[PDB]
Amino acid sequence: TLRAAVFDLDGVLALPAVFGVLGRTEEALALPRGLLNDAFQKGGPEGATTRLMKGEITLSQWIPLMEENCRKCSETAKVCLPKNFSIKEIFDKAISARKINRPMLQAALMLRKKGFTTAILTNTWLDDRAERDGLAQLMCELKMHFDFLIESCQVGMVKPEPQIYKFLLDTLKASPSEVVFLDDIGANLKPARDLGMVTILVQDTDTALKELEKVTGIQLLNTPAPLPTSCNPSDMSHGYVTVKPRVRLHFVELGSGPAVCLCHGFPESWYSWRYQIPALAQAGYRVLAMDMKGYGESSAPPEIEEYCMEVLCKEMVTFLDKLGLSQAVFIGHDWGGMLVWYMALFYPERVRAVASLNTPFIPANPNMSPLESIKANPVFDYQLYFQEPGVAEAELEQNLSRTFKSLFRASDESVLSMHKVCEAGGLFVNSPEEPSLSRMVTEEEIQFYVQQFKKSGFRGPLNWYRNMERNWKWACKSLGRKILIPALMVTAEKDFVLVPQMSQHMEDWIPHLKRGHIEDCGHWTQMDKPTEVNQILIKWLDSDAR
Amino acid sequence: TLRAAVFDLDGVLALPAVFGVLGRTEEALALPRGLLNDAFQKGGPEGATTRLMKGEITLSQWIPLMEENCRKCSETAKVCLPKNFSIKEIFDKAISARKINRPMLQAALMLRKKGFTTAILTNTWLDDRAERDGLAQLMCELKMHFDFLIESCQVGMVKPEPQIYKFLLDTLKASPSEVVFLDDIGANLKPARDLGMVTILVQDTDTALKELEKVTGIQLLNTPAPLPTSCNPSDMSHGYVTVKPRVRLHFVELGSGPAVCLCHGFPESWYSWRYQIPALAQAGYRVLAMDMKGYGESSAPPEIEEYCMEVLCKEMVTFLDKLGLSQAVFIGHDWGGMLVWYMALFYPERVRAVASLNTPFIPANPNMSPLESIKANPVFDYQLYFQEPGVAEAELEQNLSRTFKSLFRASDESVLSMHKVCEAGGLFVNSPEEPSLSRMVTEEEIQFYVQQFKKSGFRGPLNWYRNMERNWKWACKSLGRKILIPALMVTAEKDFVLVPQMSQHMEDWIPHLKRGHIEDCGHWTQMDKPTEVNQILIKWLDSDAR
Ligand SMILES: Cn1cc(-c2nc3ccccc3[nH]2)cn1
Numbered sequence A, B: 001t002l003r004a005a006v007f008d009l010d011g012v013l014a015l016p017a018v019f020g021v022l023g024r025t026e027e028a029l030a031l032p033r034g035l036l037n038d039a040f041q042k043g044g045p046e047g048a049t050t051r052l053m054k055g056e057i058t059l060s061q062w063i064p065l066m067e068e069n070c071r072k073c074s075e076t077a078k079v080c081l082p083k084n085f086s087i088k089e090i091f092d093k094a095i096s097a098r099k100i101n102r103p104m105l106q107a108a109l110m111l112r113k114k115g116f117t118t119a120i121l122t123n124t125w126l127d128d129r130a131e132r133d134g135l136a137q138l139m140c141e142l143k144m145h146f147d148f149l150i151e152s153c154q155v156g157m158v159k160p161e162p163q164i165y166k167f168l169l170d171t172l173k174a175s176p177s178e179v180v181f182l183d184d185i186g187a188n189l190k191p192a193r194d195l196g197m198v199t200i201l202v203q204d205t206d207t208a209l210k211e212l213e214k215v216t217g218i219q220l221l222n223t224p225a226p227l228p229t230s231c232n233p234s235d236m237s238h239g240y241v242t243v244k245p246r247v248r249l250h251f252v253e254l255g256s257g258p259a260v261c262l263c264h265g266f267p268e269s270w271y272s273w274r275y276q277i278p279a280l281a282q283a284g285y286r287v288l289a290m291d292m293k294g295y296g297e298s299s300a301p302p303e304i305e306e307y308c309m310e311v312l313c314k315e316m317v318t319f320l321d322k323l324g325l326s327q328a329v330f331i332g333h334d335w336g337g338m339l340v341w342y343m344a345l346f347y348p349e350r351v352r353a354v355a356s357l358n359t360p361f362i363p364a365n366p367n368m369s370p371l372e373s374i375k376a377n378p379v380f381d382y383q384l385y386f387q388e389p390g391v392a393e394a395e396l397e398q399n400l401s402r403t404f405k406s407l408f409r410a411s412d413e414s415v416l417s418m419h420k421v422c423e424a425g426g427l428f429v430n431s432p433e434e435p436s437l438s439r440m441v442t443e444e445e446i447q448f449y450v451q452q453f454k455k456s457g458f459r460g461p462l463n464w465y466r467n468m469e470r471n472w473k474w475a476c477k478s479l480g481r482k483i484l485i486p487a488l489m490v491t492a493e494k495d496f497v498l499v500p501q502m503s504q505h506m507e508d509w510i511p512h513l514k515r516g517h518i519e520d521c522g523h524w525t526q527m528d529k530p531t532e533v534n535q536i537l538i539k540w541l542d543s544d545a546r
């Protein structure tokens, strides 16, 4: 029956409400109870505040009218306003005080997830204050989670006028009894109730959510911790840069502030960063999430040496040059992890800071050919399988859904060891035709990877493994250096390929290295533990990159 | 005969040279003449400094070796280093002191323009200092103007070793007698001279340029003021955002710092900002240069109302939402100019500051239908011609080269009045079939516009003129407001369509409006007077947007 849910902003989605600060301001300054609220509401439907709320005038133009209203109210109550009484002041403070009410937002998210159409209905203003940006951010963060944001000042109508409800119902393509509306002002609820809408008078958040749960039949209060916001590919800004005549790099771009360039592993995609991208943007960073060379919408030339680390690094530097970035923060996972350590060693001037998930920095051994070094560790046997061009490509392309559903598994779900892969003749020889779906990924998400790898297959990606000698000789040039820029190593407890122990000597070469560790986390760190990853990266970014 | 020109960086392309600061530092601190230079050069080919220059170690690792070298030199000269003697200190200061030597760069530009291959050959270091970014910027600005940048620390070789010259000659695909090399250290010139290269010992810049002029046969000294750096379309980062299901916006993106969104006019392109894009990026801004709806690589739906100002503005706001930008600076020219004033009036929270080239802000007249208002000014008669769908499209698409070559003209070059265009039956009825090429644009640049407009023609662009009534009714809602965010109006003396006088009352609605004025400037402001435009915008950005 209920198909839509509408949330007020002041006092419902954002707290403390500003009338809150009119109450407190009167008290703090020992004025008559309600005086400020009388000034605010003066003239009712024709007063200064309605005109503001309807979009007739801007917030800066209203400020001096509210002043005058405050003078008039005070003279008629036979009191004086204090010296330095400042309307702008009180409001700037009130407006920066309000934050998103997290449990209300998550309840709106959940309802949207079970198929509700959701909206924000608010009396608000055209904000031209010097400090307008703070609310612009808050409104951006809230709005991306809802089907509609309806603002009185954009539509020329105000709660409680009945026209804005008819505008609401009509935007919603729904009938009044299909709608629940939460608001903290009972007068606002009155006309919605008249048309037959369910309404909820919002005082404390938890009781409103209890009413909302009872009315929708959906569990909203005490619900488990939700995943971070993910990314829908067709809502993103997609960027393309030609780094040389045969070679373009594609990236997804979100946010503003210091550039943070995310470099995914094998066999992955920009989309492997879906849970980090909105969080890092939201934390004040300009996120650039690559398709690395070989993948997705970046070019995938066939030649093996197009994928040695030297060339891959030179091309990432060209990518910064063409974009006009003197530096970026480089955060890599897996093969992208190895690449960011090499950016730190050969291009420190271009790297604001470097972080890697899972991939340790281990300096090349100049007395042991890397084929040798590899043969001295059973867990890297599968890399020998990867060498012969064509062999791994045929197995991995043969059925894409099976390939990613077999690879993308949480630590208690595995279906392949990387164990005697050569001996066995393949990576999947002893895994199922139709693997079950991991808890980490939906069917849709697997099909995004499938569709990406239909463009170029596994030649480019596999070629990353096919430059052992060439990478070893280049790495050997760097054996005198240390990494002395800000650096973060994050280990994953249950990555059985890139194990935490392999990172144990890194402080010898990176003396001020910082660390995070994630327990109960397999190799696919970003989608295995997105919440913990976000917290470690954002905290390290804020202290070391900013 | 000469086909290539190679410029040193320290003392040639960048000034003051750092050995300069070793001289000054000794004096300032009353140490023995040359002591610092002795420490620097200690051990010659095997000493700490060569290892740095070859890329064996980073700058941070070298600092404490130079210290020790400074201790050893001082004890052997029987003196004491002062208290707080700081190698890091001296170098940070020396490195931030060096700026681009503008006349050398312009000479390199000119030689490149007459077909020389150009390069920078420098002994430099892997810079991992806290402050590394300053040099990263300087190196970025210099490098984009040259075919190659060869750095000792990236190639593992140093001037004056003869191997780096063989590497030079081989990168240049040239023989030693086809090459001139400028350097401020004679030892560096010695081996180039041995292979038969022309060399120039650089002391004062002007004498080196005189030698370089005499040797190349090209005038380099006292040459007229060059145009700002332009953009080559295939070197840019190209960005794409879907703002709604039928509609994507394309943009070119360069730089980092506060977002600056450039909005071109009719019938134009992101490329109309080619001279502003590198300058504004270079000035510390993140430039986003749009193809506006209707143009170039943005979508061009056919319906007229898809181009009313309301919809166009809503979609620019969606563009910010998807890119994750809470605000941008909006700078418009012509129709893009009108649009940015409307962004300031309806979305002040999303606009950091607003500037317009040529387009004044004139509030709608609510007592006069705009068709009327238009008919009351002979200079806007041509807009009536634009109304009837199809008519102007056929004339303007009929021959694209002629269309842009007729439109894109400097003020003393015109071939069309906008005068009795209806009466005459067309915009070009009395202009030539094959117009001469304006001084403002090359043949190539016209052909970029031609190729852009082959994608969608003139329907979308013309539709911007086809919403007079609809724009008037929307604009009327804003008649109570003023524009109170930071705002810049730039008038063009000889724009005979959007004349300076039409802007004269703007202070009534925008009380703190700032102004620029450009004399001897026609309607195509950005390409007519690129140098002056850049200076006015960058100065207004730095004071008001930053
Ligand atoms: C740098 N590096 C990356 C790997 C690796 N092997 C894999 C095998 C399967 C899936 C992901 C994998 N990632 C090893 N070394």
Ligand SMILES: Cn1cc(-c2nc3ccccc3[nH]2)cn1
Residues within 6 Å of the ligand: B265, B266, B267, B334, B335, B338, B359, B382, B407, B497
């Ligand atoms: C907002 N606005 C733009 C114009 C205009 N007319 C033109 C006629 C020709 C070329 C460019 C032109 N630009 C008038 N008003």
Ligand SMILES: [Mg+2]
Residues within 6 Å of the ligand: A008, A009, A010, A011, A012, A017, A183, A184, A185
């Ligand atoms: Mg409220």
Ligand SMILES: [Mg+2]
Residues within 6 Å of the ligand: B008, B009, B010, B011, B012, B017, B183, B184, B185
């Ligand atoms: Mg020099």
